């Protein structure tokens, strides 16, 4: 599935990974309602799961 970057979001630990608001990224797991894992081109990592659309 993908989610749609709503912000910015720099990584601030070594499990999470950055995006850039309007990126479209992969959803890799939502199973935990505050962090998802995503896929964002060559890295894969945590982001806040309120900063993301599922599409």
């Known amino acids: 599935e993908l989610v749609l970057?709503?912000?910015d979001y720099q990584e601030k630990s070594p499990r999470e990974v950055t995006m850039k608001k309007g990126d479209i990224l992969t959803l890799l797991n939502?199973?935990?309602k505050d962090w998802w894992k995503v896929e964002v081109n060559?890295?894969?990592g945590f982001v806040p799961a309120a900063y993301v659309k599922k599409l």
């Open 30 to 32: 939502s199973t935990n």
């Open 42 to 44: 060559d890295r894969q």
């Open 5 to 7: 970057a709503l912000y």
